[PDB]
Amino acid sequence: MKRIVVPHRWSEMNRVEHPPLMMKQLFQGVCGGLRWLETKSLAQYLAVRAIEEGYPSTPGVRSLQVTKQKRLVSYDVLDCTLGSGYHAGAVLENGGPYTRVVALDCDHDAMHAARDLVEEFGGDRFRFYCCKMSEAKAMFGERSFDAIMIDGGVSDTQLEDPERGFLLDDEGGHRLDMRFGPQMGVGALEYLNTVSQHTLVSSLLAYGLLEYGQAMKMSRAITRRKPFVDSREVLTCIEQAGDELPEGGWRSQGSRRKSPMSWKFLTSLRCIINNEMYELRQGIENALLMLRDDGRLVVFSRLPWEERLVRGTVDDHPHALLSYVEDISIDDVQIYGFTRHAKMWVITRAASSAYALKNTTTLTEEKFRESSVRWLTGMYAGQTHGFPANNFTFENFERKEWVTLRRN
Amino acid sequence: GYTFADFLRRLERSPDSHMAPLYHEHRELFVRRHDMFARVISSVTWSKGVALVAAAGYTQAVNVTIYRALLARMLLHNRHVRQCGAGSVVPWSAALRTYSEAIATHGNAVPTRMTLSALRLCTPARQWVAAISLLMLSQANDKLTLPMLIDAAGC
Amino acid sequence: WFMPYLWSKEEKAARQKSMLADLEEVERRKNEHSSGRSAPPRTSPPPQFVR
Amino acid sequence: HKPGESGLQAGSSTTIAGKETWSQFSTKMRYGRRRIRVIDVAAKMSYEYQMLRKMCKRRPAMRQWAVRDDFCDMNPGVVIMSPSMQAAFMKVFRMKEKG
Amino acid sequence: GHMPTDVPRLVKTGNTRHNRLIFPLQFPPATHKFNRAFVDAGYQRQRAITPAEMLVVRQEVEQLQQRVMRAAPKYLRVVRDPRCHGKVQADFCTPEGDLVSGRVYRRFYGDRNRVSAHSTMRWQHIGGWKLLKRIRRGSLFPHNVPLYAVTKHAQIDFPNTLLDTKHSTVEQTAMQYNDPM
Amino acid sequence: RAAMSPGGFSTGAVTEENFQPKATGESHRVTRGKAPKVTMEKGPSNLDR
Amino acid sequence: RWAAKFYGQVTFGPRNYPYPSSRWLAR
Amino acid sequence: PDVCVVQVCDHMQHDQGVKRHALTITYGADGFQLRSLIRRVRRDLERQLSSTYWQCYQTNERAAFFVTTKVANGTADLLTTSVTQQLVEHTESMGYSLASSYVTLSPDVVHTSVRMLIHNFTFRRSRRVSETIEAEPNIPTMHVGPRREPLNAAESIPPRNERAVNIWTVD
Amino acid sequence: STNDAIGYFLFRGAAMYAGMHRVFFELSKQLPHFVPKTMLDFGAGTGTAILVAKEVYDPGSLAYPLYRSLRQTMQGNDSSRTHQLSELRYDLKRLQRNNEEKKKVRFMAVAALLERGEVDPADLPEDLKREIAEVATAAATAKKDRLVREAHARYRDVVDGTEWESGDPLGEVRASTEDPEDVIDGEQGDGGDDGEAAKGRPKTWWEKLIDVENETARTRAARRLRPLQEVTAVEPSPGMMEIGTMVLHDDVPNVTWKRYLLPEDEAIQHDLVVAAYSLSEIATSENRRRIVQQLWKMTKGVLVFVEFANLNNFNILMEARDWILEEKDVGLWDWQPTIVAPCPHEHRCPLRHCKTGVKRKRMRICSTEAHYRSTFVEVWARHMPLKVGIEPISYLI
Amino acid sequence: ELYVPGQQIIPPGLTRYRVDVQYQGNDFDGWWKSTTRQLSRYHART
């Protein structure tokens, strides 16, 4: 009678979790909306129906044959990145019953946070997969979730782990594999030893920070001095070109433009590997496909290029409307140690006429004269009679393809 | 100049003590290919297989499929010594040693087919305390099945 | 002859300086670091045995 | 462009409220047109069914030579795009204006 | 009266040309109940094709393709497009390291006599006249069928790829005849 | 060539960090310039001291 | 003007290629 | 045997306040269970430092190995004095006692900053003559970045229909 | 850049799609048993070569169905022949079976299973009705793949308003369960020896008919023949990578996007390495002889070079043909390079050394050509409406 | 038959024999040479 256990490693013994960013401000954002009130009105409509048929009550003032039993009022939420599960746990706890959370993550180490949530409540309220946030539309389809919450960046579990990278003040040579999941390729030690000087500059300029006068100085130091045994020889070369790293590490409460070139390089090199420009742009535009009509979308932004991407998407997408943007409360910066520039962008979807709201504020006279030219010259034309264009239509089915679904 | 069949012939004609140099001589076939190691275990004697895994334990990190193919070759040698009539059966001590090396290298990662092969190898020697110990080990790891009970009652 | 005729004195000086700098960098990197891998090995090699 | 009028026709109204520009109308036509019409399965038989239909009508002494000619023809023919490829081809085409 | 061989009979029809005469060794068909009593003289069968017939002939197709795949690395490779004016003439990458140019005729012409048991409609499928007419370059051509007037292209030592065509004519002549200036 | 030559056939333990790759980039049929060799260091005489 | 758009696209090595330095170029 | 000699050959590299060790522990005779020696080193050193800075595996029946990848001066001798204490305490458990020992430090190589610390021990015959399995492979694997396969992909579970009741009691 | 990557994919999309379908048609014919369980794509700018390898080796797990009437969907692979057998059996029951007795079992069992749920009593008095239950379980699993093809997205069952089943939410016991179907040669045991003595039993055409007409063992043959589990794509430029991710993530799930090929990376052994239109795009500063020698050492199975038919590209491909054929006599015979397609002689190519190719540029390229239905982009940029486009390609398997 | 880790492995099917020879050296070209001259007296080894 010998029980077998695998010996724990130091990253497993001294594992730290991620602090809650905002709990009450998220629950009003990711739950509350037009999809929430008609859900809460449907629960009150079913309660007064239950006392009508003759069920036992309390004195108080008011597809196919295997799956015939479908669920009641339940409010389906998708978590693109659960991380430590505090934002995924606030929806199922404070929402009470009739709520669900489907959680995704890039790292398999979030199964520990997914395991601890099922022990409280599971099987019918929690569901977990391991995938990127851009592959959510490919595995859930359009109009799938009543709400979608999106986080970004690195959790505090991956920061303090010496095997996951992200250690700046450890004074020891560890491999600088700073990536969020196994679905990406090379890490930063293998990137900076193989990237050219031109490819590194063009990747740094995509994230706004570390502009062309500063990006060519940091890339000159990398490409000329790259025997890189470990992260320690990289951090000496980075801090020699620019200033030394701040004492706050990755989380610096200073200004964005007043931050040193060493912090601007390391925060952008983290974004180069995991491709946060592609992951957040496709994570937002697929979420507006997967949302229901008048749903809610919550995206957290902690970087100034992320504030341009959320602002740039909602003005051009013909369903997205920014409900409100909330900054981080000042008390959560002290006890938890978050970034002061962290905002919460609560985006809602429109049923129709989303551009009629945006033309109230943003409609200039030069936009009106440009719109007259594009109708006269016909620049709003697409393609219909080409080879791939004849097989494409809108979301509503035609009369020609309803006869196809009868036989198929 | 040489193929895998000539290498298998050189392995099957050489003695067991020469399992260590040739494995270290042609280690380009074994250092990254577990399929080649499984094929080279399944094509030779069981004693040459346990000599090869004893040589490879100090160099590489062998998987559970290696010990699975080793127990499969030992069961096939038991079948051949049942059908032909000459030679000795595979000793239960070698089967317990192989299963113990697999359970010390890979803990709670071996299938129950490993325990089934170990019980089928401990069956013709009528070693029942080994079956009781294997049942206790498998019950402590929360994996106790009915064919394991069948083969332990056969032991 | 057209390419040295087009170049000035400081351009040819910069060309020779960059050529000698890249040459000595390549020579010191092939004398110090071996076997490629685009990375130093970070660990001393394990002890070899006579087989 | 008022949302009541169609895009190919032209509206006669001169009002401004509740109307989108044609740069914005071109956005929602590139956005909303993502779907492929349903392929009729029963209308077109499979290619393995069509060749085995022809092998039954051939003489059995001549069947070995038709297999040799079908094997030695390494050209698939006119390669039309699969609907998985046609969806990816239009996904790139709908992310930017035609101009 | 032809005895089955696998050695092609080379009939030299002139300088740099010869004639490859080999015959593709016809096999008997399967003896299952769907091949039996097949109406061959009619050519207008209206008998109902059961799905049992299509699954039997599917396994016969896999047996015949497994037989033709064993001879597949011994086949030729059509490298230039065939011309078709009665005869079919193409260029082939042989499995000997040679570039030949052979002709395929529609009607039967044996190595010893013209007498045979085939029609013209049969032998146009046997000898690959229907095959080589319909295939373009990059596909296989059998070695077992006879090839008429095969001429081997001359070879040089240095590759002709990435060679300048602005050379003079007498040095392009010296370059192509393997004796450069 | 004698200073860098290992005595006899020698093998060590394998890990994912130590590789010794076959990434040469030239032909394997040529062996001119491929042997491991030390640079010759001759010490000074006492006249040079 | 379409050819000058790719000048910011080439690598820094063969960018100024008829001249060794890029300081004395036309800016 | 009646005596036991343990020769340890370090390979040091120093770059301005850091060290880099490579200890090849070697015993004098066969019979010493070095699998129990290494698992004493692995349990002691996992609580102090992560496995991303050091590895420890067996290379022979009478030889072991241990490395350290460029840590600071206070961290490196923390590892070597923890290895050399589990070296003697494993041999004290065999029935021996440390008779004598010595240490030798070598100068630098003529072009590199590489040292060789020779540490030798000598023991003598002192003694007159259902636990938990903790399983780990001999040659360890590197945990660089995220995991490629999930946490439950390592362990194996039987099917639920084949599961039986426990015939021994479990408390 | 990403603006160049849009115009590269919209203009060369159907051209590279047809050029890869030409090579995989010959690879499925010449090597029928090959299933590339892991795939590397060198220089995968746009994922056309990964998408066709999904279409050739796994036509059933795509989001959208293939046009079944085409010759390009008739491959020789074991996974393709399994999917073609299901589509053939659909055509047999619809066309070659005039009896409507198939309908009589369907609409009765639909009416039977609907009425036993809430009106009729239990199935306990009717004995030996396991033929109804095991078909209805198999018909239910046929409905699960039916809704995936209608919605063009897997994991649609959790989207629906059905209740989630309690137990295993994370998928831990489904990914770690012991399969009872994989039995190696030693794990089988204690059977009648007449089954192992009598060889050559299923040689009759009748026993072959029962081998294919049942579908319970075909799914067991498909779970072992996993066609594409892990796919690795290599691309240095970020403009191509973010558009190649948009192509592949809808139909090819879990694709690892590496940014650079390292000399460290050749310790990972893949079944298929595809360098599609990438050997010509390697810059002159990088040693191309090192890269194509590294790509050969990452192959368990097939290494596929596909290039456009050009004078500079054919010289690159013929040099890469000579560099890999130089690795013949280095070691073990079973790992030496063999040319499967197109050139069968393994000497120098006679068209590369012909007499006529000195002064004639047309007799220089040992290539082939693929035909395709051109899109609206190609007929706009070439000013002529080509309903059939021509893509000449040089390939090497 | 035991194995020691530095012994000469003789491949199967072959057996090693010791030959003791002598030659004059003035008449021969010597033993085997590695590289011969490029662009009467034979080697003793051949």
Ligand SMILES: Nc1ncnc2c1ncn2[C@@H]1O[C@H](CSCC[C@H](N)C(=O)O)[C@@H](O)[C@H]1O
């Ligand atoms: N593109 C992406 N798709 C899915 N998960 C991602 C992702 N990028 C990062 N992640 C994951 O998100 C985690 C950090 S998000 C940080 C906060 C945490 N999610 C929370 O709710 O409290 C990391 O562990 C990372 O693995």
Ligand SMILES: Nc1ncnc2c1ncn2[C@@H]1O[C@H](CSCC[C@H](N)C(=O)O)[C@@H](O)[C@H]1O
């Ligand atoms: N040296 C190199 N190493 C790796 N990739 C390279 C490379 N040189 C060029 N490439 C990449 O290879 C790609 C070839 S374009 C071909 C795209 C894709 N293989 C297809 O056929 O659909 C280019 O996008 C380029 O970015």
Ligand SMILES: [Zn+2]
């Ligand atoms: Zn050729």
